[PDB]
C-alpha cells in the first residue's frame, strides 16, 4: 500500500468527480432550460439520474478499499449496495431503450409517430425502473454485514447453498447486463445505419455525405464505447468466478482498472449522449 493504493484512490476520485460533474451538469441544463418537454430529453434525464446514482456509490467503495472494513453500518450497506446494483441495470436498460427509440425513429417512422411521444417515454421509463427494481429489492434484502478477520465486511449473503445462488446472481447479471444489451444495441444500430445509408436524403452531395459519415461515426463511437467499457470487467468477473487465481499486485490493478472502466462508461454517457446532442449544442450556443 505504497504507490498502488494512492494510485487507485486517486483514479476513483477523478472518476467520481468527473461523473458527478457531468451528470449534475446535464441534469441542471435539462431542468433549467429544457424542462422535459420532449421524449429524448426525458430519456437523457433518466440516463443522467441513473448514472449519478451509480456514481454516488463510488466514494463508499473508495472508503471501503482504503480502510479495509465497513464502518457505515448495516442499513447504509444495504442502501448503497441496492443503489449500485439497481442503477447499473437502470442505466443499461436506459441505453437499450434509447437504442430502441432511435431504431423506431429511423426504420419505422409511421409507427415512430405513435412511439415518440412524451407519455410513451414516461411509461417505458417507469417500466424500466420497475424492471430494475426486480434486481434492486432482493439484493437489498440479502445484504448484511459479517465480521471477517476482525474487519466488518459489507457484502451479500445467500441462502444455502451459497455457491449456487451466488453464481446464479453473477451469471444473471452477466447475461442481462452484457449479452442481451450488446446484441440489442449492436443489431438495432447496425440496421439503423443500413436504413440511414438507404435514405436518399443523406446521400447525394458532399456535405450530406459528410453529415452521414458524422452520424455513422457517432453511432459507432457509442457502440464501441459501450462494448469496450463493459466487456473486460464482465469477462474478468466470469474468469475470476470460474478459475481461482492467486492474489497479485497486477491482479488487483487489473481488477480496479476493469471496475474503473465500468464506472467510466457511466461517467462518459453524458459526454457521448447529451454534450454531443445537437439540440443541447444549440442550447449551449444560445446561452
Amino acid at each position: 500500500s505504497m504507490i498502488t493504493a494512492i494510485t487507485i484512490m486517486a483514479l476513483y476520485s477523478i472518476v467520481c468527480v468527473v461523473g458527478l460533474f457531468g451528470n449534475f451538469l446535464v441534469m441542471y441544463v435539462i431542468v433549467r432550460y429544457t424542462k422535459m418537454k420532449t421524449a429524448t430529453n426525458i430519456y437523457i434525464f433518466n440516463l443522467a439520474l441513473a448514472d449519478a446514482l451509480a456514481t454516488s456509490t463510488l466514494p463508499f467503495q473508495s472508503v471501503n478499499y482504503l480502510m479495509g472494513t465497513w464502518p457505515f453500518g448495516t442499513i447504509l450497506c444495504k442502501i448503497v449496495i441496492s443503489i449500485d446494483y439497481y442503477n447499473m441495470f437502470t442505466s443499461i436498460f436506459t441505453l437499450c431503450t434509447m437504442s430502441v427509440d432511435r431504431y423506431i425513429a429511423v426504420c419505422h417512422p409511421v409507427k415512430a409517430l405513435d412511439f415518440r411521444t412524451p407519455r410513451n417515454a414516461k411509461i417505458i421509463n417507469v417500466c424500466n425502473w420497475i424492471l430494475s427494481s426486480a434486481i434492486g429489492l432482493p439484493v437489498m434484502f440479502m445484504a448484511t454485514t459479517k465480521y471477517r478477520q476482525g474487519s466488518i465486511d459489507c457484502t451479500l449473503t445467500f441462502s444455502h447453498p451459497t455457491w449456487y445462488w451466488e453464481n446464479l446472481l453473477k451469471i444473471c447479471v452477466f447475461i442481462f447486463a452484457f449479452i442481451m444489451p450488446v446484441l440489442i444495441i449492436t443489431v438495432c444500430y447496425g440496421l439503423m445505419i443500413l436504413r440511414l445509408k438507404s435514405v436518399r436524403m443523406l446521400s447525394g452531395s458532399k456535405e450530406k455525405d459528410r453529415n452521414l459519415r458524422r452520424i455513422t461515426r457517432m453511432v459507432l463511437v457509442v457502440v464501441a464505447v459501450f462494448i469496450v467499457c463493459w466487456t473486460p470487467i464482465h469477462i474478468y468477473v466470469i474468469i475470476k468466478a470460474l478459475v481461482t487465481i492467486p492474489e497479485t499486485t497486477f491482479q488487483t490493478v487489473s481488477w480496479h482498472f476493469c471496475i474503473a472502466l465500468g464506472y467510466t462508461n457511466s461517467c462518459l454517457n453524458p459526454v457521448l449522449y447529451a454534450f454531443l446532442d445537437e439540440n443541447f449544442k444549440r442550447c449551449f450556443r444560445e446561452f
Partner: peptide, 17 residues
C-alpha cells in the same frame, strides 16, 4: 418522399442529425 421527411424530423428530434 413523406417517409424521408418523417425520418429527417425524427433525426432532428433525436439530435444525431
Amino acid at each position: 418522399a413523406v417517409t424521408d421527411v418523417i425520418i429527417k424530423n425524427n433525426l432532428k428530434d433525436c439530435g444525431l442529425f
